[PDB]
């Protein structure tokens, strides 16, 4: 993964040396953010089925051509696979808050998404329409923390930049 612990232990391992004093100031900064980040993971873990229901059909309200014969939302069961396709990306945002870094996104959700979505003819612009809705239907304090709404929104822009 990519987090704060895996980064300083790799550059220690890639230089043949013990954990130095700069390798412990970094994990000190994991203590000063876990109490401002794990409550963003707490809110998303109990409210996911309501935030994926409204973000999933915000793309079908935007791109209404997908419900045509020959398209990506042809029948009902391919619409239900898309809601399953979107409820994975909210699950991995939840894992990046728990780990702290962006490892779970760019190793389970981003890596290889260009080859898959070109082959199976899935428009990535409807993925980023379902993720930009969540980032905006994001009133700050109301839904989450000060940053807890800063942390949660910092990973919803990692998806949009990686799918564009």
């Amino acid at each position: 993964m990519k987090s704060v612990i895996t980064t300083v232990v790799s550059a220690a391992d890639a230089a043949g040396r013990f954990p130095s004093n700069s390798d412990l100031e970094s994990i000190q900064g994991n203590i000063q953010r876990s109490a401002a980040r794990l409550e963003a993971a707490e809110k998303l873990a109990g409210n996911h089925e309501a935030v994926v229901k409204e973000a999933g059909d915000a793309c079908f309200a935007k791109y209404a051509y997908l419900k045509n014969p020959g398209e990506a939302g042809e029948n009902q069961e391919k619409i239900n696979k898309c809601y399953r396709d979107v409820d994975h990306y909210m699950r991995l945002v939840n894992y990046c808050l728990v780990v702290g870094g962006t490892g779970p996104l760019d190793e389970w959700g981003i890596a290889g998404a260009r080859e898959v979505y070109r082959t199976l003819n899935l428009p990535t612009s409807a993925y980023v329409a379902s993720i930009a809705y969540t980032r905006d239907r994001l009133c700050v304090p109301r839904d989450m923390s000060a940053q807890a709404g800063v942390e949660f929104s910092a990973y919803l822009d990692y998806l949009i930049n990686a799918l564009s």
């Binding site: 809110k43 409210n47 089925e49 069961e77 619409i79 239900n80 979107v86 409820d87 304090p141």
Partner: protein, 144 residues
Amino acid sequence: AKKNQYMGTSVAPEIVLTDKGSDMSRKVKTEDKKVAADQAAAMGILANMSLYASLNPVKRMTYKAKEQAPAYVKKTGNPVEDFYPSSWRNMAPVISLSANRVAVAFEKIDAASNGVKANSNNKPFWKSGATTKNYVAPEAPAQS
């Protein structure tokens, strides 16, 4: 001519002071900005005062609220949809006290026991559906 042209436009002189300690660093900039109604930070004020006044014992009396009507929802006939609708299904307040914080939260809460979760009736539509061809059982007569 009696009413000034400047009232509803919501502009205001925003003053910025810059000071770095030196003498040649001390500008004041009185420029004009149309200020904007910040929609999102009102919910950090409107909700927190709505639970400040929820927990007042002596401001829920001498400040009594009016009798708000419910919405235009139609009664169907089954009480598990009429009395407990899908917008308020399984919602409950969870109070999370800490040092100098009350922190109630209303979110959909449930179960566990044995594996399954309570809900699994109203799953999301992408989670289930069209797995197998689905048959139906004949009438098993009576017996004696």
